[PDB]
Amino acid sequence: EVLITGLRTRAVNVPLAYPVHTAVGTVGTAPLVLIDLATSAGVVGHSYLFAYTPVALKSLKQLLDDMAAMIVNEPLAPVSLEAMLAKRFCLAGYTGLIRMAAAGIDMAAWDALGKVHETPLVKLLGANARPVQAYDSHSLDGVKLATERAVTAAELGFRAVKTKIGYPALDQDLAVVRSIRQAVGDDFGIMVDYNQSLDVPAAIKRSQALQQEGVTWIEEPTLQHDYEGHQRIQSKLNVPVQMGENWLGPEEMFKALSIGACRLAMPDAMKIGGVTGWIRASALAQQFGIPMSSHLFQEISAHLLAATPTAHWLERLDLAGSVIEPTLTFEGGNAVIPDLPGVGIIWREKEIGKYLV
Amino acid sequence: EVLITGLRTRAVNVPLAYPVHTAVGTVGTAPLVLIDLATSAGVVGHSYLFAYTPVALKSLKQLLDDMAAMIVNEPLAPVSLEAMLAKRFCLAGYTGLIRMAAAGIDMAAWDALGKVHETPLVKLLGANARPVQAYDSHSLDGVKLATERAVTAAELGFRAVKTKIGYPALDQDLAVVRSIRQAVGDDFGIMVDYNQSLDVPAAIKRSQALQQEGVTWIEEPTLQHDYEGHQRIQSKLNVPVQMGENWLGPEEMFKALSIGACRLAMPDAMKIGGVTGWIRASALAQQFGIPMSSHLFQEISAHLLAATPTAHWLERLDLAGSVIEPTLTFEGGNAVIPDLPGVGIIWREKEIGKYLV
Amino acid sequence: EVLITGLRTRAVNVPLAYPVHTAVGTVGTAPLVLIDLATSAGVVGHSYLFAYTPVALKSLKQLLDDMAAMIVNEPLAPVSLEAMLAKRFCLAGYTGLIRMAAAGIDMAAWDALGKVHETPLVKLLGANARPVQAYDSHSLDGVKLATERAVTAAELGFRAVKTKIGYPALDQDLAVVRSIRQAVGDDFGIMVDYNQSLDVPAAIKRSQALQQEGVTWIEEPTLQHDYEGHQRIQSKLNVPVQMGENWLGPEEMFKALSIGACRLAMPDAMKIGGVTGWIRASALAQQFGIPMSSHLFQEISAHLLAATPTAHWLERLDLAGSVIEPTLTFEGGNAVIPDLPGVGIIWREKEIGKYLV
Amino acid sequence: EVLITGLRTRAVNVPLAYPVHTAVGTVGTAPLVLIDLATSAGVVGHSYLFAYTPVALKSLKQLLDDMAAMIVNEPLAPVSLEAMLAKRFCLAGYTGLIRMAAAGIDMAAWDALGKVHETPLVKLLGANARPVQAYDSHSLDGVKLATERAVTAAELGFRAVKTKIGYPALDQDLAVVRSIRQAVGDDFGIMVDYNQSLDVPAAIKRSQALQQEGVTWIEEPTLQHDYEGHQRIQSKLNVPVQMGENWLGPEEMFKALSIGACRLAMPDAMKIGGVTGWIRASALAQQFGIPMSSHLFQEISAHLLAATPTAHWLERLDLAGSVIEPTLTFEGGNAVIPDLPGVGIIWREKEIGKYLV
Amino acid sequence: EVLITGLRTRAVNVPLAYPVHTAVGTVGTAPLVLIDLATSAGVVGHSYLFAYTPVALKSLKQLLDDMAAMIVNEPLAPVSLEAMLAKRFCLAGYTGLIRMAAAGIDMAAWDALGKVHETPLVKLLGANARPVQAYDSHSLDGVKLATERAVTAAELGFRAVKTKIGYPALDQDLAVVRSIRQAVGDDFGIMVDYNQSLDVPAAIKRSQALQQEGVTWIEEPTLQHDYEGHQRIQSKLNVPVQMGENWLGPEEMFKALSIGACRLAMPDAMKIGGVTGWIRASALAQQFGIPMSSHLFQEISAHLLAATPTAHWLERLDLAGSVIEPTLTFEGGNAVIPDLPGVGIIWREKEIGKYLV
Ligand SMILES: O=C(NO)c1ccccc1
Ligand SMILES: O=C(NO)c1ccccc1
Ligand SMILES: O=C(NO)c1ccccc1
Ligand SMILES: O=C(NO)c1ccccc1
Ligand SMILES: O=C(NO)c1ccccc1
Ligand SMILES: [Mg+2]
Ligand SMILES: [Mg+2]
Ligand SMILES: [Mg+2]
Ligand SMILES: [Mg+2]
Ligand SMILES: [Mg+2]
């Protein structure tokens, strides 16, 4: 009886203060699709998608725009909507860009639904808002910049940072991780991220050396889809293997966890299938005894983690900061959910115009 | 910021038109605990619990009343509340009557939360109301009465019935199913329930005979906790083994499904952990590819099934009809969710006095 | 040193004589992306992609056009090109539409490489052209039309047909298969395809009924990604379960085969990763002892099957006949590779204008 | 021919010298249900139940009182009695409070049966009394108190102590364990108990550090029901993982041991199902090669361990000391079974009146 | 339409500068069968076989000569040819010398096919030529010679060497490996090869000691066919176990990898089944997440590795240097594919006459 009455998308390419250097390439800007889901209640649901590379940006927007025809005039009922989209894309493949588009809709629909009820999303999911510990997420920065960003993060109150590694030499990975340790002291988390850049034996070798340095976790040591390879790496480690950002739907998470690919999980609110997929993922993580963190989408992830029984860390990487009001705050390194209906995303309408593609 | 302000319980032992005869004993009356959860928003959540035997009835109500102090002044946030209860009871054992009590609180809290937002529970969960196919659930009734109840159910538009079996002789099981089949015809579901009465070999022998007869499923053939035994029974059958009414929390369901105990599941809204446990349960049934039905608690299960990705059947067994307004209805054998906020449970306050224990 | 010098795409929505009705919806038209890969040797590679639904069509073409910059001036070396694309897209997700796009490029590059050496693709792969047995692939056509199409296919020399099933009732599935069987006789293959429409228990029940009827294989009985569910279905059957058209890359095929999901495979030349993915796929089917058929893309699949150690059937479903010269022919039900360099795809340039989206 | 002729229960709330602080909450008093089972032989069987929290105390007593109706007038035959109770509670769930109540009956019935035959329980089970090594069981006490209690225990002749850990920081766990080591010297056991307070990766991390300190075992590192999680923790340890106090019946122990959850077991005489369940548990522990200790109930556990083929340690935590005569003694840290019929429990009738609820 | 028109073989016994001493015997000379495959295109395909021992040399040549009857007049289509040979030797056993003979034909046929198209083999397989890192492969040389050869290899630009170990005492293995380390410095690979000489426990013991020295891999620690034994050794190592040179066909590799025998692979271009088998092996190595190196046959292996998705190292052991022109070069320790059609093998016709048997 509340119906979806419009979908508007905007492709933006937002320059970042700190380009996200990885072992497999640099993300120099954030290509985002900003989503507005109009309703017959008058409120408008907001979400966004991260396209990773500009190469995928216009394709993802086009996809969403063409998907509008299947959602406009449907009830604002995110779970029913997700089931209908799964069905419609049964043949084409309910994964990749199609799944990402469906998730952006889902996240906007839940924001709208929080607005219909005039309640923060976390409360609509039946949980209380609580502060959620966050790590400041850096990149493949080299010793000088990694040291400078680590000092800044510690001054801001964060109790952990993540760096991206996978330099040509292991000694280079170690050099950056040790330099960070000098900047932050011994009572402080250092997560490390390989971004899929190693083969299994190289990952076992580099990971055991990193484990001697006392890192908090080792994230995507090898090809994301290779769950058996992850398991093989994990079998040789005391430190936990972390993955999940590339799981497309909870069904991919289920396969990973069923064979013991990792001891931590971090679904991406977009890839996992939005709020609807995330809640399913949290049910899996709970049964499999897996502490569950977030990947990007800090705005919605602060809500989702508060509803997550095995909630672990929130990834602070502010991809949408240039176009979204800073209503999400950080007190003593913990993300604090703003007291606003739905997700608490408010567009910076003047700023958006600068970045339109 | 809606708070819980009070808890009231009432223990009743309600007469049933048809005593529930099973192979392991008769439930001749319904021992229920009726729960009222008061809130600072002025709305009152309702739910009830089934104690199975009057022997457990006063103990269950006493437990609930002693739990009142731990929930009064807590936010009305059923997910956070469930985590607090899991923690408070982790030494004593968060299972059995304690888990049942926590579930009754959970179902009242979600009823209340629905009332806070003036919305049916199904919509609060992000799904659309839809009619849910229901089977009319009977008992170990003997040939004559089973056949009558089946005809009557067919006349009312039900497309399936369940009968409870496990007579002293397999011939008797078969004579009951055959007489039902002759009276309802070939295009009609007949589910059967052994209520845990057989050892594994007897279950294989009886179940293979029933499979030759055409039954819709075979339910709890052996001891409920014996998941491996169920798996052994299932391995000898084409017809699906059904279970789940006895799973206490989604963690028991997870263990049963992890080893292939059954091809169908039917969690009990109370034993699975209320709405909170049910939603986690539905995530599991989806990943494991298990069609998921309900057990008892028809009033809330109509809502819950509507939000369940692998929704199968609703069990129609009206344990609480003597004390609850008939707002749930059946059209062509399908449960129709009432257009009322929360669950649509309204006490028949005139009738409750008759049955107070 | 042959280089890629340009990429051109054209999106078309081509009418089909017979809409492809499936249990999960109808593909009434063929949304295709037609690909031209220009090279510094003056030859032009051709391939096409199938978008399944017009909803994905513009997005897919936009993605391809945005990929033009990353392949222009790269050597015409399809294997090296595929590794570069896997790497460029490893963050975004080398699956779904992105993987499909990479595959379309791959098939054009191999077409081009064949033209560079003036040799049919099959011979470039180190194999001899041989006739490949083909089944005529039909749809959820109802009794009358299915029987007509089967007779017609028999008259044309096909030794098998595939019909799509999953009618509301199992009786309907059986009535269609029976009427086909009476009309084509005992010595004739009837494949059936459920198009992911059944849950596991329904698939076991329906499949065991069809097996009693004599069918050649049972295809995608359940959700395509549910490899474990397929394994459960297969374990209850003598008749082979068939799948693979939805595997995105040989890595998905590897996971499905590793757990015994099916006894037959049919990769889709586009989804499996083009010629490069197909060849890897054929290595896997060989080791796992899986007879391997094709899905769609009949023009290139005739070449690919000829080089496939466990080659089984070619699927005849002419999605692109309206825009591609009929150089592939059928003699006594067998696909005959044209004596032309590369794939033997020649555009009907007069007809393409009619269907441009 | 000897019959049960009465059941009397008394709820008591007994203040403890040393409140049992755990990582998941404090047990400040012992809420017990004292049980007297009258017989036609005139002797009265004595046992008690531990309710863990006062919240559960009145519910458990009520449950027992209502259960009296099923046991009065039954033969005093604990094994037959247990089978009847299992049956009666088949539907309600023979676990949790119901199972605990059944176990209290069973323990009283075996005490009575020892009295009928004028023989210590251990001799009735067909074993000789032998001294059984005991550890003095402490709590989450901090460095000052842990040190003081450790010194006292060593002076009393105990050769091991247990402390409860799970402080906010690992360095705090280590600090307490090391301080204890200073108080007791190097030839002395220090067991440690996490009381379910850690997730799997935190447990692996903390446990490997504790293992470097030379602790005797690591008890319930994670959620008690999560056997797979325990196994995962155990797989990374040389030190044994200890659990079992929360197994409700030998059927829960069987599941744990079947998947290698732990290398030690310690059933709780109440939760395991009393004497009847304990003897079954000991048969399992023997076959699985698991040294079996006791949890609480030191009075009866001294008998049961003497009949246990893989008997390991007795937990000395004197919960019922204020209301039971000190007939169980300790010589050189070994529990010495008193020469008294049955269990050797004699009520302190004057003391009981002070603690009645 | 291009046909095989002749096969000529020449048995040669070529003295080596450095006899290949192994723990199981010395290879003092290289017994090779040089192969020329004449075609109707006029070009002649070249390959060679390594017979290992002179004892096998004349038998292998005779075998090839008798096999000529099945290939002459067949199309030059290596994949079709391989399938025909597999069939013809179905009964006799398509393994050992027979398989090796088939592989020599296959390698010559692909060389010829590269020549027909006037293109380097690597380009015919659809890949670009790239430099491939090579290690200089030494033998069971003792400290003096191992040191001298290690210095030479480092001067030549190689970044790794392999030595063969399995001396009577472990201290001798360690002495040679440490002496090599002194000669090459710390930033340099030392692979070690046991040539099947140890039993599983001896291999675990020696391997853990070698692992402390920092060797790059441990190759064939035990009997080549004992995959389960390899797995057992691998289970106790962080350093990777390397094997594969003795896999006869990709079907043997598949079995090894299916049970986790090793974390690295190195097929032998001859034993694996030539180019046709190698491409299949590379598809397996990719799916199993196994970095794949080469064994001997450096001329063709430089091509094959460039087409190998998980390409690791090229083994530089120049067995055929005395009879093949040095068109393969090494720049900074990387093998550089010559710009010549096919494999780039050109006979030293004057040199061959000196070594004929
Ligand atoms: O792997 C990543 N994050 O954890 C990542 C990758 C690209 C951009 C931002 C983050
Ligand atoms: O097994 C049962 N139902 O499916 C059942 C048992 C007791 C009372 C009501 C129902
Ligand atoms: O399932 C299928 N084929 O086998 C199919 C589906 C859609 C269009 C064409 C074919
Ligand atoms: O975990 C425990 N003991 O080993 C425990 C818990 C509560 C009270 C007494 C003991
Ligand atoms: O094991 C070997 N190489 O890696 C080997 C064996 C004999 C001759 C040459 C090499
Ligand atoms: Mg990451
Ligand atoms: Mg039942
Ligand atoms: Mg199909
Ligand atoms: Mg304990
Ligand atoms: Mg070797």
Swiss-Prot record, chains A, B, C, D, E:
Its EC number is 5.1.2.2. It catalyses: (S)-mandelate = (R)-mandelate. One of its GO terms (biological process) is amino acid catabolic process. CDD domains: mandelate_racemase. The keyword Isomerase applies. Substrate binds at E315. Belongs to the mandelate racemase/muconate lactonizing enzyme family. Homooctamer. This is Mandelate racemase.
